[PDB]
Structure formats: C-alpha cells, structure tokens
Amino acid sequence: QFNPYGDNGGTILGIAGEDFAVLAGDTRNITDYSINSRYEPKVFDCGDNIVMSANGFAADGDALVKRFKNSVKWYHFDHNDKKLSINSAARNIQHLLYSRRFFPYYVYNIIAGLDEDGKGAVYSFDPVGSYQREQCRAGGAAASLIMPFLDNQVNFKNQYEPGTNGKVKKPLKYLSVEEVIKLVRDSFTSATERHIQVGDGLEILIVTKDGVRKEFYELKRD
C-alpha cells in the first residue's frame, strides 16, 4: 500500500525577545537512517519581516511555505501594498492548514517576527491548524529534549531566590539577543549529542525592526 507521508527529521526553535525574535533550525535532511543533505535550508524569509519554518514531512513543509509566500504576495495586490502583520499571517496560516483537515499537511509550523507594537512575537501551529502566540517553542524531532531546558533557562521555572527557600521566585528579567543565541546554540548542541536526526548545521534567522539577519553555525556530522 502507498503511504503518502514521510519523515524528514529536523528540529526547529523559536524565541521571542523584548524587541526581537529568532527562528532557528538545523540543516540536516534525512530518511530512516540515511542523510539526504547536510545543508537543506528549513527556515525561510517570507517577506514583511516574517520568518517561517514547517518542520516534519518536507514535501508538505515546502508546499505550505510556498503557499504562504503566495498569500503574502496576493495580500499586497488585494489590499494596496499593506504590510501583513504577524497576527494576520498567523490567522491566515490556520485557514491554509485546515483546508486539508482530512488530508493534513504533516508539519509543525512556527513563524516569528514583530507585533504591531514592535515587540517580539512567535506563533506556533499544529498540523491541522490550531495556533497560539508563544514566547518560547521548540518543534520537531528533538522538541521534547529542548523545551524543558527553555522552561528552566528562559522562564526560570523551578528556580527560586537563594536564602528564601522556595518562598520567592527568580524574577523574570528580559533576555538580550546575544543571550538568546547562546541558549539556542546550546540547545542544538545538546540535541545533536542525544538525537540522531539532529546535526550537520544550525541556521538562525533574527528579526528586528531593521530587518532579517542570518547566522550559521556548524554542528556535529555523525
């Protein structure tokens, strides 16, 4: 029997800063125990200061991104070159996913950018179209490895202030872009060690009011 779905592995991570946002993902593409590519870009600049990554089944991931990029283009045509806000893009993507409720895009989608007040924004989706705005989200193969670490090191969960012994929590101080990138690199380095589908390379897209910047880092190739 023909199985229309497949698993291309990979892992993605989105973090929302105070006035910035990052969307990172490894560049390894796989089937079963083989490597297809050590560098196959997975996070894309979709225009209007929005970045996007559809992780899971690559064919459905490429199709969704392609359709959203198209949706942005037609949004400009139909509404006098108006900028598509991150919340509007998020709602649009929900309807793209649910159009295939009975033959789903097999991907976990994340977008990142800035909201209309200039603050950092991350939105995360499920294959069938449920979405919500988040501060921190890891998706894909090693998502379960990374998320707990981010709960601890980004939101300071289970961390209290010395001397008080559990009475006073660690205060939720904001993180800089340099601090976030450190947590991203360590997350993927740790995921690479313990997950066979994670490795080869790490590509990070950083979004600010100035635009979209890229950063690349090598990962272990074994």
Partner: protein, 233 residues
C-alpha cells in the same frame, strides 16, 4: 495506489568544479528476474540537463514523454528557444517536482526517484533530488536506492562539503563515480555491469557516454574461501 513492476535501481551523481556528473545502469528488473538489459535511464533535456530516473520503468517512460513534450512546448512562439529562453535545469526540476507532489496528493504516485543534474545559464551547478512523495533535497552528492547507502559514503569522501567542490576536478569526480558503480555491482543484487554516464560541464557542454562496463574487478580471493566454518577442503 499501485506497486512497481519493471524497475530500475540506483542513480548516482555528484558536483565537481566546473559541472556535474550523473550515472545509472542499463537494467530493467522484473522482481528478481533480470529481464531487460538495454534500458537507458539517463534522459538528456537539451544540451544543459540530464534527468536520471530510478523506480518503475513504465512511469519513467511516461516522464520521458512529458520532458520531450516540454521541449516542444517551450519552442512554441519562442525565438530565443535555443538561447536566453531555453529550458534550464531548475525549470525542468520544478516542473517534475510539481507533478510528483500532485500525483502523491491524489494517492496515485509516479513510483520513481529522480535526480536532475545540469548547469544553469550563469554557469552554476544544479543537482537536486525528487521522489514519489514529492520530497526534494539538494546536496554535493546525491544517490537513489542502494546508491544512497553505498555510493554517497564514497562520493562524500571526495566532496564532503560545499567548499570541496572547486577543489574537485572532472577526472577525480568521474573516477569516484566509476568506482561507486563497481561497488554497486558487487553488492546490489538488482544491478548490472553495463551502465551509462553523463557529464554536464559549463565549458565543454554535455558529454553522454553509453555502453560503459564495470572493470578491474577483484574475484581471485574467492578460490581460497572454503566452507562456512570448519571445512578445510
């Protein structure tokens, strides 16, 4: 939904400094029966692209006809059909990738794994893979079926990453490909000695080699091997 009947095995390929190389054997298998021994699975499109196909042969012949019709259609009302508005490897690949993904989305796939190798207008090397699921990826080396398991490891020792491409000559790349085809003949039960090889270079153009054979094979050591453990005679 179907099952593949008459099939073609591995297609292997790699980038080198001035272009790309692609190769595939000339066998059409019918299950375990080595039925057809004169099957060409590398199909040139113009003088800048070669499409290598594995999997179901009936679907390959269908794809072969789509490409032949694509060239015809591109020439219609096109004075620059043999120049600026000629078919590019990227155009040919994206067309196939669109077809493959649509067919899988109708639950009626073309049961193939395809590698499109070529050189673009600006001299850039093109090498991308697509299969029955519509899955696409690119790499300095690409291989289908058994080639993915046995050829890629050998070809990646020559071009391990992007920066190794300018350091790799056509002689070295061809040597690596030819060695890989020998290894596949040793170890793939659904392969043949006879194969075809194509080189697309940005300077010397398209060189298509037919009726190649695997040579310099090691078998002599077999005479000494006796029994399956304790037997001496």
């Amino acid at each position: 939904t179907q099952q593949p009947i008459v099939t073609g095995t591995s297609v292997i390929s790699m980038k080198y400094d001035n272009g790309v190389i692609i190769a595939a054997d000339n066998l059409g298998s019918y299950g375990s029966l080595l039925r057809f021994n004169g099957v060409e699975r590398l199909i040139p499109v113009g003088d800048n692209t070669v499409v290598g196909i594995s999997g179901d042969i009936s679907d390959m012949q269908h794809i072969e006809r789509l490409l032949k019709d694509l060239v015809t259609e591109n020439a219609y009302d096109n004075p620059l059909a043999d120049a600026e508005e000629a078919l590019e490897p990227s155009y040919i690949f994206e067309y196939l990738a669109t077809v493959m993904y649509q067919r899988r989305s109708k639950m009626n796939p073309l049961w193939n794994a395809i590698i499109v190798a070529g050189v673009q207008s600006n001299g850039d090397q093109f090498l991308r893979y697509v299969n029955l699921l519509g899955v696409t990826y690119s790499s300095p080396t690409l291989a289908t079926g058994f080639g993915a398991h046995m050829a890629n490891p050998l070809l990646r020792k020559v071009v391990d990453r992007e920066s190794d491409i300018p350091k790799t000559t056509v002689q070295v790349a061809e040597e690596a490909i030819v060695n890989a085809m020998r290894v596949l003949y040793y170890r793939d039960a659904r392969s043949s000695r006879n194969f075809s090889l194509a080189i697309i270079d940005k300077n010397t153009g398209l060189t298509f080699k037919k009726n190649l054979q695997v040579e310099n094979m090691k078998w002599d050591f077999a005479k000494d091997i006796k029994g399956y453990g304790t037997q001496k005679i």
